[PDB]
Amino acid sequence: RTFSYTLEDHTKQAFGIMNELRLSQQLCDVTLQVKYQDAPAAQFMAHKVVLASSSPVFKAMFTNGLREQGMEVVSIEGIHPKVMERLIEFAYTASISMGEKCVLHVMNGAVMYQIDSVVRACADFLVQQLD
């Protein structure tokens, strides 16, 4: 009496569309303004719900108890713009790539937004690079 179906690639396909929408700057409700020390300021438009799905830190920031009147600007310090870019790409794609010289800075940024997956991968890379 009961019929049930699952599309395994669905989440992969849907995240692909969400990343397309980020890059077109469509349906975005947060702008991250990133200023790190000497480097020129940068900004990143995104979807609060997607960032929240990949970072307990963004989730708490955005789930405030009074719903938001539109597009929010968020000031970020202490993370290089190039690192934030890579973390956002991870959330939207599940992949991240960097040069060996940047692995430490990305791990630092991933600790700051509690992206446990990226923390683990970077830690494991650094340790293999020993001895």
Residue numbers in the entry: 50 to 180
Give the article text.
A major step forward was the discovery in 1999 that the primary repressor of NRF2 is KEAP1, with 27 cysteines in humans, 25 of which are highly conserved. To determine the pKa of KEAP1 C151, we used a construct containing only three cysteines (versus 27 in full-length KEAP1) consisting of just the BTB (Broad-Complex, Tramtrack and Bric-a-brac) domain (residues 48–180, with a S172A mutation), which has been widely employed for crystallographic studies of C151-targeted electrophiles.
To assess the protonation state of C151 at various pHs, the thiolate-reactive probe monobromobimane (mBBr) was used, as it produces a fluorescent monobimane-thiol conjugate. In contrast, for the C151S BTB protein, the protein was unmodified by monobimane, confirming that only C151 is modified in WT BTB. Positive electron density near C151 indicated that ligand was bound. However, the density was ambiguous and not continuous, suggesting that the ligand was flexibly bound and adopting multiple conformations. C151-conjugated monobimane was also docked using this method. The scores overall were lower than for the pre-covalent docking, and again, no one pose had a distinctly larger and more negative docking score than the others, supporting our hypothesis that the lack of clear electron density for monobimane in the crystal structure is the result of the ligand adopting multiple conformations. Overall, the data suggest that monobromobimane, with its relatively flat geometry, largely hydrophobic nature, and possibly its ability to make hydrogen bonds, fits well into the relatively flat, hydrophobic C151 pocket in multiple orientations that place its electrophilic carbon near the C151 thiolate, significantly accelerating the reaction relative to the simple thiolate in NAC.
